[PDB]
């Protein structure tokens, strides 16, 4: 998670960067305790079940937009950012995180490296991504690869300057897509210390049962995870 949030420079909103996060354990308790995000909105997921729920895959979408344009990142809400650059599904089960970064993404002479899609031919279908810099034909005259009237470049640069106001400051936005289709994405789950000489209920790598958990002086092969007896009942398990 740190590499996405604490990255040096993000990709622009039109070409937002999609990172597949899988085969790891989530620690969302840090994000709530972070208290460094200007926007912290979770629509389809509530914090009570968020930290202890399993999903097939989670993707890290991150980009940089302006303060006034943070609010368009919402299911149902549309506009110049939510229609041509990145549209959330109206059934957005996930979270929206944004924070101010006028310190990094603002140059004195003008940070013109973060761009958007201002004017796109149509609206976008779900899971559609317009990275085409195709010159717009805003009339009848075909654009022969050259700029001019009715021939405009579909990408315009943000006027990121430190002197700009709150709404024009660069607000770094990270969206973690929650979806479920195999559960390689989980949360902390709290690894509770074990007990000895007591039959209790345990969760060993997704295995549950009742029986006394005592010391054992057997050496089993490292690759094998757990064993069974003649009657196929589990008799031992390896703690990570």
């Amino acid at each position: 998670f740190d590499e996405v949030f604490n990255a040096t420079r993000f990709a622009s909103v039109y070409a937002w960067n999609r990172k597949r996060i899988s085969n790891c354990v989530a620690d969302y308790s840090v994000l709530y305790n972070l208290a460094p995000f200007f926007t912290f909105k979770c629509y389809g997921v509530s914090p009570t079940k968020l930290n202890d729920l399993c999903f097939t895959n989670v993707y890290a979408d991150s980009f940089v937009i302006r303060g006034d344009e943070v609010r368009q990142i919402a299911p149902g809400q549309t506009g110049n950012i939510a229609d041509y650059n990145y549209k959330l599904p109206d059934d957005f089960t996930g979270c929206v995180i944004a924070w101010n970064s006028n310190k990094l993404d603002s140059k004195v002479s003008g940070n013109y490296n973060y761009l958007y899609r201002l004017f796109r031919k149509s609206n976008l279908k779900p899971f559609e991504r317009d990275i085409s810099t195709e010159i717009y034909q805003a009339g009848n005259k075909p654009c022969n690869g050259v700029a001019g009237f009715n021939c405009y470049f579909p990408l315009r640069s943000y006027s990121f300057r430190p002197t700009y106001g709150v709404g024009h400051q660069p607000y770094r936005v990270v969206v973690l897509s929650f979806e479920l289709l195999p559960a390689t994405v989980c949360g902390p789950k709290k690894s509770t210390n074990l007990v000895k000489n007591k039959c209790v209920n345990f969760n060993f790598n997704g295995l549950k049962g009742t029986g006394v958990l005592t010391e054992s002086n057997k050496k089993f092969l490292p690759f094998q995870q757990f064993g069974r007896d003649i009657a196929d009942t589990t008799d031992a398990v390896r703690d990570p």
Partner: antibody
Amino acid sequence: EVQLVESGGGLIQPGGSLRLSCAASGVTVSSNYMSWVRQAPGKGLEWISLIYSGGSTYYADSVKGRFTISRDNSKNTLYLQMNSLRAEDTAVYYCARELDIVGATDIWGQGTMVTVSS
Amino acid sequence: EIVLTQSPGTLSLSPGERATLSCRASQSVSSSYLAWYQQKPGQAPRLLIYGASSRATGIPDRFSGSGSGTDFTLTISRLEPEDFAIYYCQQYGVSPPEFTFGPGTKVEIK
């Protein structure tokens, strides 16, 4: 030349229905952001609705739910389905072009009269 | 809601004099999302300035906008007889599409 020509106004009883129709010449409305702005007699401009080139339509709460905006690609003419009329809806209704790049309106139409009286 | 407040409501000045209008927003506007208009009696509003600094096409250079945050101001270097009419300022919010207009200013021949 680029100009808009509003039509479809007139006298309407309260609770009646109308459909304003302003055509565009020299500009393709389907590719642009487009809004309706009215002017109550002796009052300031009140924004009615905006339709995105992406198709999303938003309204002010004073007119939300009663009206419906639409667009015909075959004729380059705007629509604003007028319904459930009350007395203070009487205003001169302008449809005018939104420049994009957020917050500017340059090309206005001449204006058409809408009167809501018994 | 970001309410636009214009000042003054009436500004009586002679031709050739400098007119100054102030349109103050109830909240800090995001780097001048302001549109400026000319409206004459019986005529539709005519845009002059977008971004509170950039003049539109066909707008005399005597008009010049200025402002940031909450305060935004027009300066008319020379008042001409065709310029005397009712004037409205306009802003845009994003989460609602707030096209809030100012109360207005009537500039009269003095």
